[PDB]
Amino acid sequence: VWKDADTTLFCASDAKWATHACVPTDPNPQEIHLENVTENFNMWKNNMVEQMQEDVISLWDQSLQPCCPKISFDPIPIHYCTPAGYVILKCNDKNFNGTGPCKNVSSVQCTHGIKPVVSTQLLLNGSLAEEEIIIRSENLTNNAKTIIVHLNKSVEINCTRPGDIRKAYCEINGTKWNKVLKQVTEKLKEHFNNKTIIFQPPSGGDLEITMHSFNCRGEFFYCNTTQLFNNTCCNGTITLPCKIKQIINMWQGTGQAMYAPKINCVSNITGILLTRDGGANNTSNETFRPGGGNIKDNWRSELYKYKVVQIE
Amino acid sequence: QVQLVQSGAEVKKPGASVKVSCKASGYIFISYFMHWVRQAPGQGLEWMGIINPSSGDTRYAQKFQGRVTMTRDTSTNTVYMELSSLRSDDTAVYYCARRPGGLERHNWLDPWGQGTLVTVSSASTKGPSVFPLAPTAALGCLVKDYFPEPVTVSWNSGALTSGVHTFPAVLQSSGLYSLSSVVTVPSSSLGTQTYICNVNHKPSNTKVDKRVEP
Amino acid sequence: EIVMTQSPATLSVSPGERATLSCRASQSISSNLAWYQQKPGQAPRLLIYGASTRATGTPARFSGSGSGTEFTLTISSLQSEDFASYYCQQYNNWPAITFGQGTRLEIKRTVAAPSVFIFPPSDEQLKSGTASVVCLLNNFYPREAKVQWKVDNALQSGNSQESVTEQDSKDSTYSLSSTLTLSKADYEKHKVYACEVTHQGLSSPVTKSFNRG
Ligand SMILES: *[C@@H]1O[C@H](CO)[C@@H](O)[C@H](O)[C@H]1NC(C)=O
Ligand SMILES: *[C@@H]1O[C@H](CO)[C@@H](O)[C@H](O)[C@H]1NC(C)=O
Ligand SMILES: *[C@@H]1O[C@H](CO)[C@@H](O)[C@H](O)[C@H]1NC(C)=O
Ligand SMILES: *[C@@H]1O[C@H](CO)[C@@H](O)[C@H](O)[C@H]1NC(C)=O
Ligand SMILES: *[C@@H]1O[C@H](CO)[C@@H](O)[C@H](O)[C@H]1NC(C)=O
Ligand SMILES: *[C@@H]1O[C@H](CO)[C@@H](O)[C@H](O)[C@H]1NC(C)=O
Ligand SMILES: *[C@@H]1O[C@H](CO)[C@@H](O)[C@H](O)[C@H]1NC(C)=O
Ligand SMILES: *[C@@H]1O[C@H](CO)[C@@H](O)[C@H](O)[C@H]1NC(C)=O
Ligand SMILES: *[C@@H]1O[C@H](CO)[C@@H](O)[C@H](O)[C@H]1NC(C)=O
Ligand SMILES: *[C@@H]1O[C@H](CO)[C@@H](O)[C@H](O)[C@H]1NC(C)=O
């Protein structure tokens, strides 16, 4: 009984793109438990992220179009679901890393309040790692594939535009952030046998992937994350100089956009995107850099615990 | 297996409230949601609400928000429906149902309580009077002057079922119901086979077993 | 927000014909849905779930296409069992399990004469308050018919109660009962009691009577 498949997954919002196109929130789910079965997952190769990318491109260009008027934009949780015939099933292993067999598997129909927010380097407003901090990668061995660390406790961040001036800033508690940073350092040591760890700024080039780029309440902020990735951390409140730039390069596809001519965002940091490097002498140290690039990763970070299949 | 059993018919005055039960059997009582729906001849069916007999959670249809309430007794595995402020047009038959299946979800209403009827009236309930209709030929039983419906009529304890016609009752100006149960039979069997009607009125615990003879 | 709408409200078809229902959803309930059947007097039966699949325990005459917004139910070679009401069912919005107003279905049958008989009042009923003669029209079609009471040629009015039967599941006919309610003071005053039947499938008005005794 049952086999993996593909299906134009529908959506349930709890609304008050989710206008008519998403059904009201199911106010009574039913994760029905499954037993004696050890199913294999591949967060890195499912089409839930394909569906998700195409749908969010639709909503993205629809609601904040490039030049171009000015109205609100903040995401709201949007469950996804399978129609009759097809089953989402759910890995409930607290320490499942995205790839491989899960035994505490149980099936249900709608996801969990997915907040479709796209970002770089740092992951925002998502669901935390249930038990201990998780590190997700298609293979730790090959470095071209990026790393998605998923935090145990989230860290809030405040980005602010104040007077009508040129650019903006952003603030973070150095205390808890450097604590959780050393926590993930300990974990990365665990998987690379107690090796010394080194954070460094991104290589450069495509501004967005060498910056913390994200759209807050209509406008795009680029925060210099050189401070957050300090090797030697000095634990006072940390400031970031963030560029609110009117010219962007489009995550939509090939092309670049411009958006027309007192605002604030608070957000939880739930994950980080990190690229390794290449130590052939292996040093006694591995170095990590803030990553990003393919928007695809953003969705895997939240759809690792699920798989769409067909009931037979 | 998959077996639900509701309460009987009931008549409590206008502006009051009523409780109808629904005992489920053949599966664990708690992993499956209990739904309540209703029918009033003059319209069709419409859904009233959802109870989770694992939680106590209730989500309701808009029109029935407030008047209806749901309850569990997950031990003697029964669900209780309670309607109140009974205005005269709430009189109807109410069904409880489940959402069967196996794995995944897909919750289609499989088993279905046979439904209880609720006549919100202002009149004292009274047991019916059963009577003969003696004459291929045909006979019957006249059950008249009763309230409330429904009264169930079975010939020869349900051994005579083809040719039996049980009409819908009529309310005559006196404020009571009357109906009749007739049956067609071979002309030769009259006097040869005994024919008796079991008339059972559940509200006022009535069973009259009256034998018809030419 | 998701308004469901049935297709025809009532229906009249002959045995062996084709019948089609539609369930129109004002919004994508996303290919769930389920079709149910309720005969007059009994507890509704589910026919189809998942928009399309037949529930093993129903004949293959039924089926249901749709997938998305518009849905349909098809009965091929409909038979006498089918004459009842049908409904469609949302249920992916877990709780918003909402119906349509329904679709009653009815017979176009052969016109048939009413097997007519008459019962005079009871011996146990006479020494109670009242008497009531009853005239039965049995297995007739169409449904439209009429009966009027005669007592010593006196046409009666305002004291007869009539009740017609469901389109029978076996022969798709109707039955009808006319109950004439009199008092023993009024019942014993006259002798000849007749009921007069007029029906579309008869050549002339028919009557059936009894002299008191
Ligand atoms: C699960 O496996 C155990 C033994 O490993 C067995 O006793 C039980 O019946 C199995 N259950 C199912 C549903 O296969
Ligand atoms: C799987 O985890 C859930 C918590 O999400 C728990 O309720 C369930 O009992 C677990 N299953 C097993 C087999 O331990
Ligand atoms: C989260 O996980 C870390 C290991 O990554 C472990 O110390 C503990 O379970 C949690 N830490 C905190 C600070 O909550
Ligand atoms: C994830 O865990 C599986 C075992 O279930 C292991 O084979 C794989 O190497 C792990 N990958 C990462 C990135 O931790
Ligand atoms: C975020 O920081 C700004 C800057 O001072 C402050 O006005 C705002 O209240 C802060 N919000 C939270 C939730 O800390
Ligand atoms: C930062 O947050 C931590 C909570 O872990 C709190 O204890 C600390 O006082 C905060 N520091 C500042 C400077 O706000
Ligand atoms: C970020 O800040 C550091 C130190 O302030 C500076 O050396 C670096 O060039 C900056 N990079 C970007 C992309 O702003
Ligand atoms: C690390 O923090 C110390 C705090 O005194 C600061 O002097 C230094 O420039 C920081 N380095 C980086 C790379 O952020
Ligand atoms: C995260 O959620 C909060 C509250 O829902 C919202 O105000 C904020 O804008 C969100 N962050 C982003 C980057 O949209
Ligand atoms: C985000 O942070 C706010 C601030 O306390 C908290 O109330 C909310 O639950 C957090 N959301 C997530 C998904 O962590």
Q: Which two structure tokens, joined as six digits, stand for A157? A: 């961040």
- In angstroms, the Cα distances linking B95 to A13, A52, B7, B22, B109 are 30, 41, 10, 9, 11
Contact between A255 and A120 under an 8 Å Cβ cutoff? The reply is no
Q: Which of A2, A28, A84 sits opposite B57 (nearest CB)?
A: A28
Name residues whose C-beta falls within 8 Å of residue A5's C-beta, 6 or more positions apart in sequence. Answer: A86, A308, A309, A310
> Which ligand lies nearest to the CA atom of residue A173 in the structure?
6
Residues 6+ apart with CB under 8 A from B87: B14, B15, B120
The Cα C148–Cα C159 span in angstroms is 11
Contact between C59 and C80 (Cβ < 8 Å): no
Residue A252 backbone phi and psi in degrees, to 5:
-55, -50
User: Alpha-carbon distance A209 to A201, whole Å?
Assistant: 11
Q: What is the DSSP string of B1-62?
A: --EEEE---B---TT-EEEEEEEEESS-SSSS-EEEEEE-BTB-EEEEEEE-SSS--EEE-S
Alpha-carbon gap, residue B170 to B177, rounded angstroms: 5
Q: Whose CA is nearest to atom 10 of ligand 2?
A: A104
Resolution in A: 3.8
| Residues whose CB is less than 8 angstroms from the CB of residue A238 and which lie 6 or more positions away in sequence, other chains included | A171, A172, A173, A174, A177, A227, A228
Q: Decide: A97 in ligand 4 pocket, CB within 6 A.
A: yes
**Any ligand 2 atom below 6 A from CB of A92:** yes
CA distance B154 to B140: 11
Phi, psi torsion values for B88, nearest 5 degrees: -65, -20
Domain that holds residue B112: 3-118
* Side chain identity at residue A105, one-letter code: V
Nearest CA to ligand 1 atom 7: A36
Q: Which residue matches tokens 């309607």?
A: B83
Give contacts of A28 with chain C, Cβ < 8 Å.
94-95
Any atom of ligand 7 within 6 Å of the Cβ of A226: yes
Round to whole Å and give the CA distance between A32 and A37.
14
3 state SS for chain A: CCEECCCCCEEEECCCCCCCCCEECCCCCCCEECCCCCEEEECCCCCHHHHHHHHHHHHHHHHCCCCCCCCCCCCCCEEEECCCCEEEEEECCCCCCCEEEECCEEEECECCCECCCCECCEEECCCCCCCCCEEECCCCCCCCCCEEEEEEEEEEEEEEECCCCCCEEEEECHHHHHHHHHHHHHHHHHHCCCCEEEECCCCCCCHHHHCEEEEECCEEEEECCCCCCCCCCCCCCEEEEEEECCEEECCCCCCEEECCCCEEEEEEEEEEEEECCCCCCCCCEEEEEECCCCCHHHHHHHHCCEEEEECC
Whether ligand 2 lies within 6 angstroms of the CB of A34 is answered as no
Alpha helices in B36-181 (DSSP H): none
C119 DSSP β-pair partners: C134
Which of these, C196, C203, C156, C147, lies nearest to C176 by C-alpha position?
A: C147
Specify whether the CB–CB gap between C39 and C169 falls below 8 A: yes
Query: Torsion-angle region of residue C169: left (phi > 0), alpha (psi -120 to 50) or beta?
Result: alpha
Residues of A contacting chain C (CB within 8 angstroms) = 10, 12, 20-21, 23-24, 26-30, 81, 83-85, 109
Helix (H, G, I), strand (E, B) or coil at C80: helix
Task: Closest CB to C96: pick one of A21, A24, A109.
Answer: A24
> Atom 3 of ligand 3 has which residue's CA nearest to it?
A132
Mutate to test the interface with B, among C177, C178, C180, C183 (most CBs of B within 10 A): C177
Question: What are the φ and ψ backbone dihedral angles of C16, each rounded to 5 degrees?
Answer: 85, -5
| Structural tokens at position A159 | 């980005």
- List all residues 6 or more positions away from B205 whose beta carbon is below 8 Å from its beta carbon: none
At C31, list the tokens. Answer: 């290919």
Answer whether B172 sits within 8 Å of C46, measured CB to CB. Answer: no
Please, what sign has the CA dihedral across residues C92, C94, C98, C99?
positive
Which chain B residues touch A28 with a CB distance below 8 Å? 33, 50, 52, 57, 59
Q: Is A42 exposed, middle or buried (0-12, 13-18, 19+ CB in 10 A)?
A: middle
Confirm or reject: Cβ of A185 under 6 Å from ligand 2: no
Please check whether residue C79 is in contact with residue C15, taking contact to mean a CB–CB distance below 8 angstroms: yes
Q: Which two tokens stand for residue A152?
A: 């145990």
Q: How far is A16 from chain B (nearest CA, A)?
A: 16
- Quick one: how far is CA C24 from the chain centroid? 26
The CA distances from residue B131 to A105, B127, B144, B171, in Å, are 65, 13, 8, 18
- Burial (CB count <10 Å: 0-12, 13-18, 19+), residue B185: buried
3-state secondary structure (DSSP) of residue B131: strand
Torsion of CA A90, A93, A94, A100, to 10 degrees: -90
CATH number at residue B74: 2.60.40.10
Instruction: Select the residue from C119, C164, C165 to test the B interface by mutation, using most B Cβ atoms within 10 A.
Output: C119
Task: Report how far residue B130's alpha carbon sits from residue B198's, in angstroms, rounded to the nearest whole number.
Answer: 9
Q: How far apart, in whole angstroms, are the C-alpha atoms of residue C213 and residue C197?
A: 23
How many A from CA of A46 to the centre of ligand 2?
24
Q: What was the experiment behind these coordinates?
A: X-ray
Distance from the A28 Cα atom to the nearest Cα atom in chain C, whole angstroms = 6
- With a Cβ cut-off of 6 Å, ligand 1 is lined by A 35-36
The preferred substitution site among A97, A135, A193, A301 for testing ligand 4, maximizing ligand atoms within 8 Å of CB, is A97
Query: Which of A10, A30, A81 should we substitute to test contact with C (largest number of C Cβ atoms within 10 Å)?
Result: A10
A26:C94 CB<8 A: yes
| Distance in angstroms (rounded) separating the CA atoms of residues A20 and B101 | 30
Residues of chain C found within 8 Å of residue B50, distances taken between Cβ atoms: 94-95, 97
- Answer yes or no: is the C-beta of A132 below 6 A from any ligand 3 atom: yes
Breaks (C-N over 2.5 A) in chain C follow: none
* Chain A positions in Cβ-Cβ contact with residue B104 (cut-off 8 Å): 32, 87, 107-109, 311
Which residue of C29, C50, C96 is in closest CB contact with A85? Answer: C50
Phi, then psi, of A117 in degrees rounded to 5: -115, 125
> Which residue from C99, C119, C175 is facing B45, i.e. has the nearest CB?
C99
CB A13 within 8 A of CB A78: yes
C-chain CB neighbours of B112 within 8 Å are 43-44
d(CA A135, CA A185): 11
Cα separation, B162 vs B164, in Å, equals 6
Q: Which residues contact B75 (CB under 8 A, 6 or more apart)?
A: none
Is cis: bond before A77, omega within 30 of 0?
no
Atom of ligand 6 nearest to the CA of A179: 5
Could you tell me if the CB of A217 is within 6 A of ligand 3? Answer: no
Shortest-distance atom of ligand 8 to CA A228: 14
> What radius of gyration, in Å, describes the C-alpha atoms of chain A?
20
- Which ligand 1 atom is nearest residue A36's CA? 1
Measured in angstroms, how far is the CA atom of residue A138 from the centroid of ligand 4?
9
**CA–centroid distance, residue A126 to ligand 7 (Å):** 28
Buried-state track C56-74, b at ≥16 Cβ within 10 A, e below 16: eeeeeebbbebeeeebbbe
Q: Judge contact between C30 and A83, C-beta under 8 A.
A: yes
Beta strand spans in chain B (E): 3-6, 17-25, 34-39, 45-51, 58-60, 68-73, 78-84, 92-97, 116-118, 129-132, 137-146, 151-155, 164-166, 170-172, 176-185, 195-201, 206-212
B90, B82 in Cβ contact below 8 A?
no
**Cα(B198)–Cα(B118) distance, rounded to whole angstroms?**
23
Are the C-beta atoms of C190 and C150 separated by less than 8 Å?
no
> What spacing in Å lies between the alpha carbon of A56 and ligand 6's midpoint?
35
- Tally Cβ neighbours within 10 Å of residue C99: 19
The distance of Cα B141 from the centroid of its chain, to the nearest Å, equals 21
- Cβ distance A105 to A34 under 8 Å? yes
